[PDB]
């Protein structure tokens, strides 16, 4: 009974502390910065072969190999330079919602409405791709997964919880709880000691991988957060939400720094990613168009050419050379 | 390691992908929704912590894949986007449970007005008709108490008299059907159609009902694809 008033008081105290630190804004500080100017990106490559709507893709750390999940039940691994399909992995469940590429390139993971996360070993001696392990224990669809290491993978689920898995044993090393809605996206900090997850409760949380508790919570969005991405230095992260606004948050000021939105934009944002330097913030929309935002000036620095359907995923190579966008039209397009 | 051998590998993967697209196009995907008290868990058995169960069957040598969604959280609004572009949704409701009948109505409303299901036709199974008949014939509990409009609703002359059952049974079941058809017609434009059916969970015809409704849905889709409309 008494504890709820304590919770409200602590919430107000946190709000007051955030206000105390809000004496300036990113726009006020970047007024004089030279604008990015108009950016044109040509579709250097169109990767064709998925049967159904693509739902996720990920880059190998080599910045050349590219995994891609489609809800036809396939993971395809692409050589982005030559457009050669390196692997086609048939999945036991066709309703894939996420995929990941191991930072070593040895493993590729996927998941979806089947609440299990399947780890695939790409480096088999038999020459085929075998399910290394199926991670089970999440109650509800699995929405995102990201490898910390060959032996550790972080997953988020409609279960409203994230979990860290010891792939060797297949057991949750730790489970992250506190979200009050479906967790829809997840991103690892570059140091891999922290990750952030956005949920349908219109909030984002910062999780300590080893401690197992959420150090911070961000609530600027008005609607479900569909996408989240760390700033390349790991001090800030962008979020994409159904409310058509992207937002930048700082882990140290513990509050929203900037909103990226336009009155002509009403579609929800499906994906977000920074460029290598962090000056560009790319976002995909239900409108069939990825918009490039000046991460500092908030200006709509450009717009990636049309997809034929909702842009579902995008990601920037680890070297920053190119942007890959997937969409429900079954094509990945590479922009540079 | 010549690049030409990698191109050969890519071409073999392309061949396999075409071989799989042939299977993908030649199957009809169906989403089986409905509350837990509905007979949907029983309807699947009459067809011939995991999160999804693909039932599979065929009628007249067309293959149906019916995906029952289980162990998912109650909030449908997110994972439902995956099922855009299914051929139909099969929505099952326990017609006899007047207490939860309004919740079934609200669930049907939310599915029908969904942003992403805007072009998906709903095959509506008004299930457990035998229990409805037994309820209305016993009279101990009456839909009158839950839906005041039933006190004045009267069976239309267009109603099918085939069963020859008690007139109260027909009146109650047709009022229940109208309760869903009203939502369908009010919100539904010409994009998608609702196909109500009175069914028992133990009923061999449900597969044929699904086949007929899917045939009508595919006919309606072709009518637009081929510019006839």
């Amino acid at each position, epitope marked *: 009974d008494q504890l709820r008033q304590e919770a409200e008081q602590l919430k107000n105290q946190i709000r007051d502390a955030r206000k105390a630190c809000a004496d300036a804004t990113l726009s006020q500080i970047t007024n004089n910065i030279d604008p990015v100017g108009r950016i044109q990106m040509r579709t250097r490559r169109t990767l064709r072969g998925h049967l159904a709507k693509i739902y996720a893709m990920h880059w190998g750390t080599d910045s050349r190999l590219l995994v891609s999940a489609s809800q036809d039940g396939k993971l395809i691994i692409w*050589d982005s330079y030559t457009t050669n399909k*390196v692997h086609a992995i048939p999945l036991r469940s066709s309703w894939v919602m996420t995929c990941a590429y191991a930072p070593s390139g040895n493993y590729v993971a996927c998941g979806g409405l089947d609440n299990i996360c399947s780890i695939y070993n790409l480096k088999t001696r038999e*020459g085929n791709v075998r399910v290394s392990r199926e991670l089970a224990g999440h109650t509800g669809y699995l929405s995102c997964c990201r490898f910390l290491d060959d032996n550790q993978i972080v997953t988020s689920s409609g279960d409203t919880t994230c979990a860290l898995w010891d792939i060797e044993t297949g057991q949750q090393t730790t489970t992250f709880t506190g979200h009050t809605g479906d967790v829809m996206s997840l991103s690892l900090a570059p140091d891999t000691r922290l990750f952030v997850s956005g949920a349908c409760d219109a909030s984002a949380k910062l999780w300590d991988v080893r401690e197992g508790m959420c150090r911070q919570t961000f609530t600027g969005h008005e609607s479900d957060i569909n996408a989240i991405c760390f700033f390349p230095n790991g001090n800030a992260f962008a979020t994409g939400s159904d409310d058509a606004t992207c937002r930048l948050f700082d882990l140290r000021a513990d509050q929203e720094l900037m909103t990226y939105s336009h009155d002509n934009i009403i579609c929800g944002i499906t994906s977000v990613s920074f460029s290598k330097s962090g000056r560009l913030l790319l976002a995909g929309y239900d409108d069939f168009n990825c918009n490039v935002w000046d991460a500092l000036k908030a200006d709509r620095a450009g717009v990636l050419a049309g997809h034929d359907n909702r842009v579902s995923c995008l990601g920037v190579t680890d070297d920053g050379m190119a942007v890959a966008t997937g969409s429900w039209d079954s094509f990945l397009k590479i922009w540079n | 390691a010549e690049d030409k*051998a990698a191109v*050969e*590998r890519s071409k073999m993967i392309e061949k396999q992908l075409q071989k799989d697209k042939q299977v993908y196009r030649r199957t009809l995907r169906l989403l089986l929704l409905g509350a837990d008290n509905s007979g949907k868990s029983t309807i699947v058995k009459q067809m011939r912590t995991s999160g999804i169960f693909e039932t599979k069957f065929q009628v007249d040598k067309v293959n149906f894949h019916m995906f029952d969604v289980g162990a998912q959280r109650d909030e449908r609004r997110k994972w439902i986007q995956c099922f855009n572009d299914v051929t139909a949704i099969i929505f099952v409701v326990d017609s006899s449970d007047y207490n939860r009948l309004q919740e079934a109505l609200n669930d049907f409303k939310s599915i029908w007005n969904n942003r992403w299901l805007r072009t998906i036709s709903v095959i509506l199974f008004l299930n457990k008709q035998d229990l409805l008949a037994e309820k209305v014939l016993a009279g101990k509990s009456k839909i009158e108490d839950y839906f005041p409009e039933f006190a004045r609703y009267t069976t239309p002359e267009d109603a099918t008299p085939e069963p020859g059952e008690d007139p109260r049974v027909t009146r109650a079941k047709y009022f229940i059907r109208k309760e869903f058809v009203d939502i369908s017609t009010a919100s539904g434009d010409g994009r998608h159609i609702c196909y109500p059916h009175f069914t028992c969970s133990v009923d061999t015809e449900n597969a044929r009902r699904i086949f007929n409704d899917c045939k009508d849905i595919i006919l309606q889709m072709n009518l637009r694809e081929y510019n006839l409309v």
Partner: single-chain antibody
Amino acid sequence: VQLVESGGGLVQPGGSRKLSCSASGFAFSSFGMHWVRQAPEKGLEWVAYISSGSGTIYYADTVKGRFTISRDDPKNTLFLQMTSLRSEDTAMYYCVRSIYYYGSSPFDFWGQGTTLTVSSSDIVMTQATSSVPVTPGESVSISCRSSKSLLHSNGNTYLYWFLQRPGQSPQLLIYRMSNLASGVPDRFSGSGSGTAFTLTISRLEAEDVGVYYCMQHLEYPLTFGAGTKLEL
């Protein structure tokens, strides 16, 4: 994983013979396959290649027309059909798998081979040092050169290094100028300028004793070096 060649024996000149190579424990259908000849006490010699799905077939001019390579994917069996045997054809024939995609390691497994006894513009590979006396713990180096530069425009240097221990089939050591193969210890290292290449063993051990063969894969026919025999 195993490859087991069968057939061979003694056949009179001008005769015909069929070699069989039974594959088990790996996805045979997805691998390209090679036949590699080794005349008695001589170096390796690529015979024929058949790609996965039989899309591509290549032969060395020494055997073109005379030999025919075929595979039966459902039976995980590879065949070499030899119609007109010669004295030149006497050799141990190895069955070798090769899977080609970005970052693959072709030639990673060799069968134990079968012995057959009988009563022009391609790239020349050379290993001037036929043998090297060496002792354990030494930082050995084995040199190689090619008549044509193996560094392709795409950045790959298509040089391979194989170790053949006495009485054993060749083992892949390095599957691209620098790329150390799987199951090979860190002792071995590869480097080169795109026309001259070196294999380094940091601290030789008794198990490293054998003949080291370089091979080019820039274009067919695949040509091996004469080999360098380490001994102690």
